[PDB]
Design a protein around this ligand. Sequence first.
Ligand SMILES: OC[C@H]1O[C@H]2O[C@H]3[C@H](O)[C@@H](O)[C@@H](O[C@H]4[C@H](O)[C@@H](O)[C@@H](O[C@H]5[C@H](O)[C@@H](O)[C@@H](O[C@H]6[C@H](O)[C@@H](O)[C@@H](O[C@H]7[C@H](O)[C@@H](O)[C@@H](O[C@H]8[C@H](O)[C@@H](O)[C@H](O[C@H]1[C@H](O)[C@H]2O)O[C@@H]8CO)O[C@@H]7CO)O[C@@H]6CO)O[C@@H]5CO)O[C@@H]4CO)O[C@@H]3CO
Ligand SMILES: OC[C@H]1O[C@H]2O[C@H]3[C@H](O)[C@@H](O)[C@@H](O[C@H]4[C@H](O)[C@@H](O)[C@@H](O[C@H]5[C@H](O)[C@@H](O)[C@@H](O[C@H]6[C@H](O)[C@@H](O)[C@H](O[C@H]7[C@H](O)[C@@H](O)[C@@H](O[C@H]8[C@H](O)[C@@H](O)[C@@H](O[C@H]1[C@H](O)[C@H]2O)O[C@@H]8CO)O[C@@H]7CO)O[C@@H]6CO)O[C@@H]5CO)O[C@@H]4CO)O[C@@H]3CO
Length: 108
Amino acid sequence: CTTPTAVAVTFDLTATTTYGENIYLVGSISQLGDWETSDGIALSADKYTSSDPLWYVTVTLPAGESFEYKFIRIESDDSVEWESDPNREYTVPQACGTSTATVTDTWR
Ligand SMILES: OC[C@H]1O[C@H]2O[C@H]3[C@H](O)[C@@H](O)[C@@H](O[C@H]4[C@H](O)[C@@H](O)[C@@H](O[C@H]5[C@H](O)[C@@H](O)[C@@H](O[C@H]6[C@H](O)[C@@H](O)[C@@H](O[C@H]7[C@H](O)[C@@H](O)[C@@H](O[C@H]8[C@H](O)[C@@H](O)[C@H](O[C@H]1[C@H](O)[C@H]2O)O[C@@H]8CO)O[C@@H]7CO)O[C@@H]6CO)O[C@@H]5CO)O[C@@H]4CO)O[C@@H]3CO
Ligand SMILES: OC[C@H]1O[C@H]2O[C@H]3[C@H](O)[C@@H](O)[C@@H](O[C@H]4[C@H](O)[C@@H](O)[C@@H](O[C@H]5[C@H](O)[C@@H](O)[C@@H](O[C@H]6[C@H](O)[C@@H](O)[C@H](O[C@H]7[C@H](O)[C@@H](O)[C@@H](O[C@H]8[C@H](O)[C@@H](O)[C@@H](O[C@H]1[C@H](O)[C@H]2O)O[C@@H]8CO)O[C@@H]7CO)O[C@@H]6CO)O[C@@H]5CO)O[C@@H]4CO)O[C@@H]3CO
């Protein structure tokens, strides 16, 4: 191991913003409130040049336990859209050697 226990997970959600919004990844953990997209995981068009139509993402979750992973597409007009259908639960372990994995999803 090393010392820190941050879980950098890369998520890739295929959606489409309107040049001004964010597709959220709220998980049930403090770094991932999951129930407050405020501290979830926003995916955007970073490489993309528009706003965030395929909304990719690469954030971290420092804990090493079970965190929920509900997704909520944040928008520019109304607000979010908690896609609570395709949900998950990243049970990040406390061990080391793999404190970062993937988290794929897509809007439909
Ligand atoms: O059905 C979903 C599909 O619908 C369309 O959505 C566009 C819409 O067509 C258009 O009106 C657009 O206009 C604004 C937009 O925000 C800007 O991107 C741009 O609009 C055009 C632009 O003028 C064109 O040059 C066009 O060229 C392409 C370019 O490679 C790139 O822009 C591409 O999309 C970029 C996004 O950053 C990224 O998401 C990804 O695109 C893929 C996404 O995964 C899909 O969600 C997306 O579906 C949309 C399309 O955006 C569009 O057809 O398209 C791709 C997969 O289908 O790659 C790029 C990252 O660099 O989009 C072009 C496709 O060859 O780009 C857009 C048209 O896409 O100027 C406007 C701002 O003033 O708004 C919507 C928003 O997507
Ligand atoms: O006004 C915006 C608030 O809602 C957020 O946006 C949406 C979000 O998806 C959700 O809140 C929902 O509204 C309610 C939902 O329909 C209910 O199903 C329920 O959700 C439950 C879920 O199963 C899940 O989230 C789970 O998670 C726990 C979490 O693990 C706890 O830590 C914590 O527990 C309590 C606790 O009292 C306290 O932490 C409190 O603190 C606030 C927190 O910041 C958010 O929950 C906030 O919600 C707003 C948020 O900003 C929007 O992004 O308000 C909380 C204060 O009430 O959180 C809870 C609530 O007391 O949170 C939960 C609960 O233990 O548990 C929840 C709840 O049991 O509740 C949802 C909220 O009422 O839809 C929103 C938009 O439609």
